[PDB]
């Protein structure tokens, strides 16, 4: 409950786990997208 | 039995809410009508002196709806700042019962006034709908998110000002009048599409302008948004301000209970 969220649970559920999953996705899974640019007018 | 601190906090918050309810909208309910007819008093003169100007600036958007979509959020922000500031000094004598912490006064003030402003927003939307104007937002979820971000930003700024200025009584006026220029630089009165471009970047430093533009963009269809206006900047501003205000209250927590 309210008087159960120790510093270990707060750090793990708000800092550690999201960073771990996001960095795993970014470094391992995410595919890179090249961008080609042009500048025109009529 | 032990009365766990959440119960004590909620009881103190309810008691403070009931206490400042009398002081906010008058002792005889003479202030509720004032805050009811204040927005219509604003829009009457605003359209009276700017109807043709807004018609030439942009069609397809009625001026009363454009003014309503920017007034009440700004009323929320301004009143949040003011009441959050005055809450700590309003109940100096009440800090004598071991449970009325200074943060509880500002929390109760915010929880009362956001409810009051939501009520008057609902009444204003109903009135606009009764006159045949457009009143239903196209994307209400994003509008609610922007409104929540603005509300929490205003509460954060009010708490920071309350914890800082408390030692300097004459500083309140310095930020009591500073809200009035924000009423003319946030784009609430007039659309920002007519502003000169060279003043655009410096004017974009105001997060309230970004929040107002984002809220308006979620209310009407095909509403264009200025380049460089985003939600990430107000979100970061508000989050950093809330963190800093909470830390500053934590540092000077005992000083505020000097009575």
């Amino acid at each position: 409950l309210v008087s159960r969220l120790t510093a270990k649970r707060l750090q793990w559920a708000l800092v550690y786990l999201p960073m771990l999953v996001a960095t795993v996705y970014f470094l391992v899974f995410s595919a890179d997208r090249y961008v080609s640019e042009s500048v025109i007018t009529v | 039995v032990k009365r766990s601190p959440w119960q004590i906090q909620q009881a103190v918050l309810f008691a403070l809410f009931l206490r400042e309810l009398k002081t906010r909208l008058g002792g005889r309910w003479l202030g509720v009508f004032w805050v009811l007819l204040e927005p219509v008093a604003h829009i009457a003169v605003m359209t009276t002196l700017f109807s043709l100007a807004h018609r030439a600036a942009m069609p397809s958007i009625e001026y009363p709806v454009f003014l309503i979509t920017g007034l009440i959020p700004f009323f929320m922000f301004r009143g949040l700042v003011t009441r959050l500031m005055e809450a700590i000094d309003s109940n100096r004598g009440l800090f004598a019962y071991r449970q009325v912490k200074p943060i509880d006064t500002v929390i109760a003030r915010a929880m009362l006034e956001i409810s009051l402003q939501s009520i008057v927003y609902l009444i204003a939307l109903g009135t606009l709908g009764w006159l045949g104007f457009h009143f239903l937002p196209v994307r209400a979820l994003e509008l609610a998110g922007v409104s929540a971000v603005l509300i929490m930003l205003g509460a954060s700024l009010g708490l920071f000002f309350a914890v800082v200025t408390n030692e300097i009584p004459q500083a309140r006026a310095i930020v009591r009048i500073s809200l009035l220029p924000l009423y003319f630089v946030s784009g609430v009165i007039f659309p920002v599409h007519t502003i000169p471009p060279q003043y655009l970047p410096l004017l974009q430093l105001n997060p309230v302008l970004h929040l107002i533009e984002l809220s308006r963009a979620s209310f009407f269809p095909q509403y264009r948004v200025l380049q460089g206006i985003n939600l990430a900047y107000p979100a970061g501003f508000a989050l950093l301000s809330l963190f800093l205000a909470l830390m500053l209250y934590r540092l000077r927590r005992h000083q505020l209970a000097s009575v």
Partner: protein, 32 residues
């Protein structure tokens, strides 16, 4: 943009955790 996104997310997570911790500390202090 991997590393900039990771750094921004790290700062945001740290700020959120600090805000939550300060809020719970403020809540906890109400005693008799």
């Amino acid at each position: 943009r991997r590393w900039y996104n990771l750094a921004t997310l790290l700062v945001v997570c740290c700020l959120i955790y600090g805000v939550v911790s300060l809020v719970v500390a403020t809540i906890r202090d109400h005693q008799d």
